[PDB]
Design a protein around this nucleic acid. Structure first.
Lengths: 168, 97, 193
RNA sequence: AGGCAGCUCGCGGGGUAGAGUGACAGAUCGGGGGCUCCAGGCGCCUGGGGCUUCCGGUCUAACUCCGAACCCACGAG
RNA sequence: UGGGGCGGCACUCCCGCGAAAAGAUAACACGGGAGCCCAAAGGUCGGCUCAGGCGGUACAGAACGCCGCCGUAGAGCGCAAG
RNA sequence: UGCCCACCCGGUCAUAGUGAGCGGGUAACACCCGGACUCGUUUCGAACCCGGAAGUUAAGCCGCUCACGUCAGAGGGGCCGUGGGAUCCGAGAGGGCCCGCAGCCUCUCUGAGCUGGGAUGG
């Protein structure tokens, strides 16, 4: 059954925090995502400077953390209950991606408190993959995959209704 | 006004490269031959290789190989009635006939 | 492609196979190359020579002929097998006439103690003078001592390392623990001809 | 004891006249379709502006995806 | 030096065009520059891909960070032009 | 045998390229399973590296069809140059004749991967 090779799998649930500056907020944001995910985060450098919004090249303005197999699903099972109705059909692209934002971090159904550190918002990105995607990201003899093998929007919805019982 | 006599003056189009010859050196099969003394070559400047590059006045001329110094060759060329010796890197040479 | 302003890259560069910036340096300096390639199941070694119409092979060696000519029994693309193929390649090259050669890694990453450096070291012991830095492989990897230790930890996960191969169901008695002992009897077999 | 002011054959070099503009950079005249704002008239109509798309037209000493006649290097006759 | 003067510098050097598809070629011809800057903006080795646009994301907006698609160069390479 | 078909190293570097859809593997090429160890991710065994082998022809890879790209041949159409000559024409701009040579664009039709060195299959 070749259909086993066309199966949809979960991959790379990424959490992003954009504070928009550098200093006195990153560390507490760094501490915040330290315990939500359980893994060490990374600061993200800014792109070309703008001289307004306060961003400049090489200045760490955000914190991100990447989760993979068997821990991505567990982390997704604890952030989804906050926004079960927030997930919409319009937020799905045509290649197997979906993203949703968290306005307030303590809104999560978890053990969140309100210490002196403060409150932030969160963004979560979910990437849907099929077996054989290694051909785009390997070092030697790398190639491209057709739209035939890509995950479509319609089947990406099913992977959310199943294994997660999400609305809309 | 008289013209500036730099090394690469009046070479806007001699040192062009056609759209299908651009990029860091394409032809390696010409570099696999080792010219011996007494061979005939054609001085063809390669605009993208900037080492051991001859002068505009010698482009398209036919020289005779007379020796080797390092990885570059000593080529004897005629300009008018004068003999001139050049030291040319092999990326700026093609065999004649 | 979009028309008359588009330049097509080299065929082997499009396929992601050849690095022409390194290949340019070899041709200028007229190197004789020792080319240790790898694949998912075997290891290939060739000793080449430049020519106008395409590279001329001076010697060749494949890992499939370790099992069909000298009774190799372990995996065909692990570190002990990389050493054995390199040793065989050096013997063929030296007998063919060449005594020195230049390593050609290709697009592989030169990691210390890896399989590519194992192939180079094997050829050095065979007698081929390949210039090398003082940062080659490690000597406990060539005999497969690291594999045996992993097999010797069968006590917890109740599974030995060498599960039966594609056709080893009724033909091959895999014994991962006694791998280093099996190494030298094969090595002594190719060392004599 | 060879030489080259000329020609032929062989093998190479070149971006001029011309020609193009959806092949780069600039200029330059009209039409059809789609989207938007503003103004006028009774949701519609008319005008101006901006973007996109398609069709045709005019140019270049300091434009070129192209490209003659012609000139030149070397070998033999 | 289209008399000399006043002006300018075509009085040293570099790029395009004049320049007629080898070489050489003038104008008080046209369009412009240099008289320095950098201990890195120099040497080497490794990894990566740029401008611009599209889809999904709180504050987020044409333009902050994240997840994807396209992109022959439409970027960058100290400073003129090639 | 065989010859050609993949693979490793290439030459030529679009007649060879790009996208879409389809066809083909019990070996080979891959995706694929896992991380004790060499090595590794400014987080992530994703990538690199190491050890493997259950599964699959769905990707890659190879071949076929169709769209555009590209190189040619043929045909319709637009534009047009030049070395030598004359007590040739013309007020000049330019033009005609004699001897010697050509070129560019756009439509339509028809084709379009060749090849050198070595280990698996037919």
């Amino acid at each position: 059954k070749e259909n086993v090779m066309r199966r949809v799998v979960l991959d790379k649930v990424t959490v992003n925090i954009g504070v928009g500056e550098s200093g006195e907020r990153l560390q507490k944001a760094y501490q915040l995502v330290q315990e939500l995910t359980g893994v060490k985060p990374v600061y993200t450098k800014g792109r070309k400077s703008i001289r307004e919004f306060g961003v400049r090249k090489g200045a760490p303005i955000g914190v991100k953390a990447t989760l993979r197999r068997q821990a991505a699903v567990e982390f997704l099972k604890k952030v989804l209950p906050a926004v079960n109705f927030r997930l919409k059909q319009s937020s799905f692209d045509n290649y197997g991606n979906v993203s949703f934002g968290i306005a307030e971090h303590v809104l999560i159904p978890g053990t969140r408190y309100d210490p002196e550190i403060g409150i932030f918002g969160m963004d979560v990105a979910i990437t849907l993959v099929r077996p054989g995607y290694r051909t785009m990201k390997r070092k030697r003899k790398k190639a491209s995959i057709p739209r035939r093998h890509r995950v479509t929007k319609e089947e990406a919805i099913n992977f959310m209704k199943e294994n997660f019982n999400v609305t809309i | 006004v008289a013209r500036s006599k730099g090394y690469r003056s009046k070479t806007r189009k001699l040192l062009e490269k056609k759209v299908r010859e651009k990029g860091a050196i394409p032809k390696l099969s010409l570099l696999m031959h080792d010219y011996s003394q007494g061979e005939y070559v054609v001085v063809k400047i390669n605009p993208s290789i900037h080492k051991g590059m001859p002068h505009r006045r010698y482009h398209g001329k036919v020289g005779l190989v007379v020796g080797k110094r390092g990885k570059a060759y000593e080529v004897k060329v005629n300009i008018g009635d004068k003999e001139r010796v050049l030291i040319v890197r092999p990326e700026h040479l093609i065999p004649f006939n | 492609t979009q028309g008359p302003n588009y330049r097509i890259k080299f065929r082997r560069r499009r396929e992601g196979k050849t690095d022409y910036y390194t290949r340019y340096t070899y041709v200028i300096n007229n190197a004789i190359r020792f080319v240790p390639r790898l694949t998912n199941k075997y290891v290939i070694v060739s000793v080449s020579k430049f020519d106008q119409k395409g590279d001329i092979m001076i010697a060749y060696a494949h890992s499939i002929e370790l099992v069909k000519k000298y009774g190799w029994k372990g995996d065909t693309n692990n570190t002990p097998a990389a050493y054995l193929t390199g040793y065989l390649a050096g013997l063929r090259a030296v007998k063919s006439g060449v005594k020195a050669a230049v390593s050609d890694i290709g697009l592989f990453v030169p990691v210390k103690g890896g399989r590519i450096f194992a192939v180079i070291k094997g050829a050095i012991d065979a007698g081929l003078k390949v210039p090398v830095g003082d940062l080659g492989k490690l000597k406990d990897r060539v005999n497969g001592s690291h594999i045996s230790a992993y097999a010797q930890k069968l006590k917890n996960e109740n599974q030995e390392l060498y599960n039966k191969l594609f056709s080893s169901y009724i033909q091959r008695g895999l014994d991962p623990v006694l791998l280093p002992q099996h190494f030298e009897e094969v090595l002594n077999k190719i060392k004599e001809n």
